[PDB]
Amino acid sequence: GAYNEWKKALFKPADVILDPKTANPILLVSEDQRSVQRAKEPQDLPDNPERFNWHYCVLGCESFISGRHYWEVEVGDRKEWHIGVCSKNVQRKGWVKMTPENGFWTMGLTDGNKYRTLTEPRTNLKLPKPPKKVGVFLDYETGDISFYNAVDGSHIHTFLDVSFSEALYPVFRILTLEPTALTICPA
Numbered sequence: 079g080a081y082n083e084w085k086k087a088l089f090k091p092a093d094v095i096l097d098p099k100t101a102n103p104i105l106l107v108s109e110d111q112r113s114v115q116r117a118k119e120p121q122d123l124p125d126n127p128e129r130f131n132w133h134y135c136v137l138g139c140e141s142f143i144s145g146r147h148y149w150e151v152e153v154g155d156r157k158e159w160h161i162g163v164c165s166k167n168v169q170r171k172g173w174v175k176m177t178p179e180n181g182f183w184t185m186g187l188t189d190g191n192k193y194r195t196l197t198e199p200r201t202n203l204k205l206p207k208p209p210k211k212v213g214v215f216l217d218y219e220t221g222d223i224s225f226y227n228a229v230d231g232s233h234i235h236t237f238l239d240v241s242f243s244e245a246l247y248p249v250f251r252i253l254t255l256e257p258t259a260l261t262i263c264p265a
C-alpha cells in the first residue's frame with residue numbers, strides 16, 4: 079500500500095533498541111531488547127539516574143535531534159499500552175503527568191477499547207478499527223509526531239508543530255500484566 083511503499087522515501091527507519099537501564103523495575107525487557115513486558119514483581123535493580131522509577135516506561139537507546147524518523151510497534155491484542163516520544167530531560171524520578179508540557183508526546187490504549195491522546199487534558203480517539211501495529215513518525219524540523227496504523231495506513235493522531243529544544247527518545251509504557259508483549263519491528 080502507499081504507507082508501505084512511501085514511508086522510507088520520507089522518513090529514515092530507526093532501529094529502535096530498548097534500553098534496559100531506563101526501564102522501570104516492574105518491566106522486563108527481552109534478551110533481544112525488542113520487546114518489553116510487565117512483570118509480576120520488581121526486578122532487583124539500581125535507581126541509576128536513567129531509570130524511570132514512578133512511571134512504567136522504557137526508552138530506546140538512540141535519540142534524535144534532527145531529521146525524519148519512524149519506527150513500528152506490534153501492540154497486537156494488548157488491552158493497555160501507550161507509546162510515543164519524550165524529551166531526553168523529562169522527569170524520570172517521582173510523579174509527573176505524562177503530557178506535552180512535561181515532554182511526553184504519546185497516545186495509546188486503555189481498558190481494551192479506549193484509545194486516547196495523553197494531552198492535558200486527555201482526549202479520546204475514535205478509531206474505525208483497532209491497530210495491531212503502530213507506526214510512529216517524527217519530523218524534528220516541522221515538529222510533527224504522527225501515529226499510523228502500519229498495516230492499512232490509516233491515520234491515528236498527529237501532534238502538530240511542536241517546538242523541540244531537546245533530544246527525543248522513543249518511549250513505551252505498559253501498566254498491566256498481560257500475555258502479549260509490546261514488540262518493536264526492525265526494518
Ligand SMILES: Cc1ccc(C/C(=C\COP(=O)(O)OP(=O)(O)O)CO)cc1
Pocket residue numbers: 132133134135175176196200251253254
Ligand atoms: C497499575 C498501575 C500502575 C501504575 C500507575 C501509574 C502510572 C501511570 C498512570 O498515570 P496517570 O496520569 O494516573 O494516568 P494516565 O497517564 O494514563 O492518564 C505508571 O506509569 C497506574 C496504574
